[model samples]
Target: NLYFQSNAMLLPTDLSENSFKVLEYLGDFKKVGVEEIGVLFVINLTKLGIDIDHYIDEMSEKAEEVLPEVAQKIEAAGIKAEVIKPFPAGDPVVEIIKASENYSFIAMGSRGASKFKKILLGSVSEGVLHDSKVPVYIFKHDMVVNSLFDRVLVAYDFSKWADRALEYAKFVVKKTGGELHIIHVSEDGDKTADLRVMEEVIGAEGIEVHVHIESGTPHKAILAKREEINATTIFMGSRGAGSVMTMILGSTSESVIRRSPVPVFVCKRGDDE
Candidate 1:
């Protein structure tokens, strides 16, 4: 069984258009077992770096008006939804991580509200990915599909973390009746041993599996294969083989998450584990 159940998902929204895109797909999560959603809107007062005590009420009022709409979207998807009382905190990332304790995973847009439009990726989302114990589901702004797991890709490196990712990928494919694509990038370019191992371990379990072995930059190879296979989602480990700094996110995984057009599920070790 997967360590985390898809029973409840925590969604931290800045009420951005990108966030709305993510909200549109809340119902599709049902296929993966999401039954409830917790919508969170944190009033990032600390970002202002000035005393904004007077504005707190104004911010809270705006959030109060918006959160219910977000909940309505989730409820429309047939999943139970609740609005977490607007959190007025110094750091949205810290608040999100703390609130995530009760949820199975955290889902958010790759980029946040337009006010902080500085890059292709949002710092808050990246911060959560680095600090959150649960899996982080990041939805790309351009991603429009309703069924995200229909064609899944798992970047495998044979590392322990990658092994966990493979297990989750298999579970998703089995649950969604989708195809599973596994790609391994090796410096040696040898496919014989790896293919044999994959075939032996992944036998015909009633799930369709496609194994790809390529030689090149790991992240580049993974992205190319994803496009070739037209994968709907990418599942990968936060850290992979040869990663020396266990505390930081792995370089390859980070690169893939930054560039992948499809939504990515970053599998990582939880705080308890």
Candidate 2:
């Protein structure tokens, strides 16, 4: 079973029907044999327009209402949702990880939902996706459903950890008969060839390879490349960026994680490291 965590601002009354429709398709996962799922709504209560108490009440009610419908869609497809709740917690990322400790994979998406004026480490979804040991699926859109997993994009830095992402991408390639796309970013405008390690890994497994290089900003170039490739999924390393405001935040990777057009897998040392 996969856990679905909804960003609460998207849950507000102002969202377009397309968003709810996305929820509808997500809840329809049971068609593929997933029998049990859970929907969790998470938010930064301190940043809401309403008072704290009113916000909580509104959150609980709206979440409870939407979750059941999501469940209903699943049930109609012949599955069940275990619970319907807002999943009250201070840190959504931690709460997601804890749920994974008890459950398995968590299903989420990227919308750059955080307080940082730019990308930062405080971005909780990046934390959960990077730190989680269990499987995490961050969908680009509801219409996109990957089965064969034919193409993968790895935003590599030529670092050891970047190799880890390449290795992981190789595993996916082997598992799904896919090709690996290795991308490197630099501040200066210099271009390079298809990465050798990635090609070697694929060669060992007899898979195809494609490499990319770009410059300017890591956040923008990586995303533009992902879009250019129409990548089925994206993987990146969480390079901690300079601090913004009073809190520590990784501006580069976190920003990319939130803003990208696909599900992003972030490599990390650990949650605390």
Candidate 3:
């Protein structure tokens, strides 16, 4: 009997080059080595606009047809990629979370769509990020390029959980060489009181953090803060800041990844624990 080990697995779900894009970020996925490769396919039918019957017929046909194509590509690449279908009602994110228990990591395709359309259809990728416990790599495409995280803005509610988010932000700043921007959205919370605390945490890590004290709805405030920081990418401890919220509300993150003008990385909530 032979026992094997898999340290990481890359997930790329969109039709675009999102899957390949993730590999580019892995520093060295092939060099570090990957085992038990997999991919989740989300059938994008926005263009078809075909009636339910015809759409179903074509979608099923396409899914059946592409499964083998991906399989062949995987085989040709000397790596393995599995095409997974989403359950109509069940949560794909949940399935991904469950898969995470077995696999090392999860990569997802995302794109930001119109707010109007998001109001109509819920986002699967966002849901998965909120619920899953793995580092869900969210790949993005068409998005308003902010400061390239030149000035990183993070919203922390001053909870212990919020502290955990700071750790995440530190890494993002290190990666981007961007100034860390921390904001606490509140009217009465001790805004100025936490300045030294933020300084100590980030400064100790050799990251210069800029703190913003504000007040408003969590999501609205963060989006505005994104504008404020001229952020190219946003780093949040939880979905409340931007990662999951953008996916769930705007479906923006998912939409961006689906169309992917650029790559997006989403670390699921479960990954920290």
Candidate 4:
């Protein structure tokens, strides 16, 4: 199942927008049915004080009544969606990590109006990225979407981290019908051989796979390519600096997520992998 966590207050804004993009992207490329879509709203009531049940009931009604409203908006486009009831939980970030135990793809906003916030890479989103057993997607409340992925770029360092990013890029290329570009900022890896492999995996008739080596700082080169392709979205490993750090999302990934004009899809090798 694909699970999405949206803040309760943000409701149909970041919560709904982020969820639909995942649904749209999956439908375009992975063919994941909308019926398989799961919407999870984590209710944080630290400030609600004494009468918590009243708020829970109100939120429950909101979920039941509004989820379909959100779901049907996408359903009109032919994607059927369903909502999952919010359970009592704590630490929105940890709550997501617990859910990741079962859901293969867990998506959430970087920040919300709540305490565990950074509108994009807030503490909550960061915690989930490091703790998830599966891939986690992070984006700002105001996400950008088009063509599922009109263009995709994978920052290739030939590190073990980059492999997951490439794997996801290949998946996106396969399903979204988006073009694929593997970028290397420096001649750090064996470009000659990797380029050939990129062709074999994601390339096809009439589909041109572009692999380019740019000279500049790694992050700048990566962002420059994002502008050149007018890419709808970019993918990168959880960390880029090397070594399997159990928790830190790579500095480069963090920088891009903060500054990139487009939403960034982050792929990390799970602890189980």
Off by over 4 Å in 2: 1-36, 42-58, 74-80, 84-86, 89-94, 103-105, 113-137, 158-161, 187-194, 213-216, 239-250, 269-273
How would you encode candidate 1's per-residue C-alpha lDDT over 25-127 as one tens digit per residue?
7656876788888888888764675458766777788888888888877888889998986464567888899999999888888653232342333367767
lDDT at position 2, candidate 2: 16
TM-score of decoy 1? 0.86
Please state the error at residue 184 of candidate 1 in Å. Answer: 1.0
Query: What lDDT is reached at residue 124 by model 2?
Result: 49
lDDT of 2 by residue, 78-159 (tens): 5555552445545666566666655444555545566464244454445565566654545445434543246788888766
Off by over 4 Å in 4: 1-35, 45-65, 111-122, 141-144, 187-207, 239-250, 270-272
lDDT of 4: 0.58
What TM-score does candidate 4 get on C-alpha atoms?
0.71
Clash counts per candidate, in order, are: 0, 3, 27, 5
lDDT of each: 0.76, 0.56, 0.54, 0.58
Model 2: which residue pairs collide?
Answer: 121-249, 121-250, 241-250
Tens-digit lDDT track for model 4 on 1-273?
A: 122222111111224554444443433422422234445666655334357778777766666766676667545655444455555444566666665555556655543333213433345555666655566665563344445455888887776667777776765565557788878877454476766676665565445578877877777889989888877678777642342232333466656765676667777673336
| Candidates sorted by lDDT, best first | 1, 4, 2, 3
Lowest lDDT sum, 10 consecutive residues, model 3, at 1-10
lDDT tens digits by residue: candidate 3, 123-169: 65566666665555565542433333355555566554455445555
TM-score for predicted model 3 compared with the true structure? 0.59
Query: Residue 258 in candidate 3 has what lDDT?
Result: 42
Candidate 3, residue 101: the lDDT equals 75
